[PDB]
Each structure stands twice: as structure tokens, then as C-alpha cells.
Input
Amino acid sequence: EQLLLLLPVHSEERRILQAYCTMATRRPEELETALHLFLECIVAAETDDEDLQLLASMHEAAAELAQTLAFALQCKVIHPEAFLGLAICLFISGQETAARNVLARLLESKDPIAILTCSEDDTIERAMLFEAYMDTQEGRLKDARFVLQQVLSANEGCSSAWNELGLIYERNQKHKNASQCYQKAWKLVQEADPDVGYKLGFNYLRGGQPVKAIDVCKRVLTHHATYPRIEADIMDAAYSMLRP
Amino acid sequence: AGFQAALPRLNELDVANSWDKLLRMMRSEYDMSCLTSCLARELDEDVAWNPEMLLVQLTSDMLDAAELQKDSGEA
Amino acid sequence: SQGEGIVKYQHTEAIQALAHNPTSSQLASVSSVDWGIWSPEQPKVSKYSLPSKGLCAAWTPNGKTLAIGMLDGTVMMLSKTSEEKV
Output
């Protein structure tokens, strides 16, 4: 938010990123303020105590501007990033069905040419990632794999997509290709992510290669030492089953 | 479970970026960014300058600036 | 040295370390159940319980004390000469 106050007030990017910063806090009242901010964004698109003081004042301004849901459902999907922000606000706040509706409305535009774009804008790709996340909670995975294969054919560096396909492989017990794509993800990440490192170490543990698991967990800790559940779930068993 | 990486503080990225404070008041109404392309990156401190030591420091800094690129060996 | 086995004696589940005293001929094996003391004169080895399986072992150059390296960190001065443990 300290950086966000550097943005022009009239800029659309500031207006949507303000809602993003408010929804980041995960606070339900902040979620409501962000939701109303995003609804205002889509409607408008259709047609050192001083720094803390500024932070507080912008928080109050968002609160009072928060004091239109059918407008999202019915209007033309002209502003995609605001649609994505609204959808993730709906998902975090708890309403999964409305998030499904709004994001399906966003991605019925192109569903592909849009992903194959060599552009800085990646809102469409992030929408694909969110759709994979939502489908992973539905009990079905075939359409999630469909989306992941699409985005990875378009974008080979999508480390999160590799992570998700590895995870659904782990559900399918297909562990060799899961480990292969996890190694792909680990290479792309440059060994600097706690979650793909965590699951890679767990796969090594299940694969019975505790030296590799120790290497992965040591990289996780030398980069993100505060990640929980890493040592007590991987390192202890790797030490225990290093020499059976 | 949720985990958020520890990223550097804004003042860690630059020590003399106090304009971050100043620019956060004027922008309360609209954008004046064409006036703010003039603020110096650093700021002067309260020190004393010996002529010979200052010249030696300037020469050493320019030599280090040259040698930082010269370490790659590109020519 | 030539390749003739002297004796082939089993342990309970697994063996971890082998330590030879530079002074005396007999060695000490570190295994799953406990550390066994096999000697050429006495094939009988006493068996006792340990919290878990050890990792490493080290004898003193004069043969005073034996140190057992353990995963949980318990290094015990279990020496036959002195029953005291540090």
C-alpha cells in the first residue's frame, strides 16, 4: 500500500490494485470493501506518522466508498483484471458458486489465442490457474488437467501449473511423472519455493531417495527458513530412513 | 498451509528514498509525476570534505565502476 | 586379509558401525538392539536394550572410553573400564 499510494488516483490500475491490497489482508470487512471496489471498477469500465496517517485515511476512504452484483452477471466483460479480482474476492469470502459464474463469464470471451499471446498481460493465464484451483476442490481433475496442458503448451515456464499437474498426478499415484514435472518446476523456480520443494521432498521420501529429499529441504530452509511442517514431516523421516 | 515470504523492506531497497513519504501527500488529489522526475536519488549529509581524500575517493569509485564491467572481460 | 571369514554372527535388525580399539584386539559393533562386544576369546556377547538404533562409534586412542553417536544426540561414555557415563 505504501507503493500503491505512489500511483495516480485517477488511474484504473491504482483503482483495481487498491482493491487487491485490501483483499490481501483476508479480513472479511476488507473483503467486502474490495468487492465493492471491484464492482465500482467494472461499472466505471462499462461506461513517520504521516505515512501511517495516509494509510489509515485511504483505508477509511475505501470503507466509506464501500458504505451491483447482477451488473457483473449481465454487463459486457470489458475489463478482465477487475473480473478476476472480483472472482477471487468471491472465492476467498466463501461464495464459490458466484466466483464460478463470474470467472466463466470472463473466460467465455476467448477460453487459445489469448493465452498464446506474447504479452505482459497475464490475467487470462491467472484465470486459468484459478480455474484449476477451483476444479481441484470439486473432486474432478480431468478438466483441470485440460486447462493445465493448454496453459503449459502456451507457457512452458508456468511453475504453478507444473505444481498443480504434479499434485493431481500424486492423487493419481502416478509418481514417476509427478517427480519429473516437479523437477521441471524445481528447475524453473531455481529451488526457491517452499511448497513445490515440500511436495518434491515428500515424493522423494515416498520414492525412497532420502538424500535428494534432504537436499531439497535444505534448499527450502536456506531460502525460506520459516516455512512450517518442513523438518518435522520430511527431514526427520529422511534421517530415520537414510540407512534402513 | 499459508506462508508468505520475507521480502526486503522498502527503505532497505534504497536508503535515500525519502521522497516516498513526500510523494504520498501531494498525490492525494491527482498526478503530478512530470514534476517529480527531478528529485535526486540520494541526499546530502552533514559531513566534512578533505580535498585530497575526496579526490582519492572519487578516483577509486570511478576505477571500481570501470572494473565492475571489466570483470566480465567483454571488449 | 586374504578373504577368509572369521565368524558370521547375526544381529537383531540392522548394524550401523564397527569400531576397533587401537590397543586391544577386539572390536565393538553398533547395531539396532545395542552395541555388541565381540571378542576373539569370548564368542558370548551380552544383549541389552537401547532407545533406538545408533549411528556411529569412536574409541579412545588409549582405549579408555567408547563414544556412541546417536541421531537424537545422546553421546554416552559407555566404557568397560569405568561404568560412569557422561
User: Anything to note?
Assistant: Residues 19 and 39 of chain B are 8 Å apart (CA to CA). Chain B touches chain A at residues 1, 3, 5-6, 10, 20-21, 23-25, 27-31, 33 (CB under 8 Å). The two ends of chain B are 51 Å apart (CA to CA). Helices of chain B lie at 10-13, 19-26, 51-70.
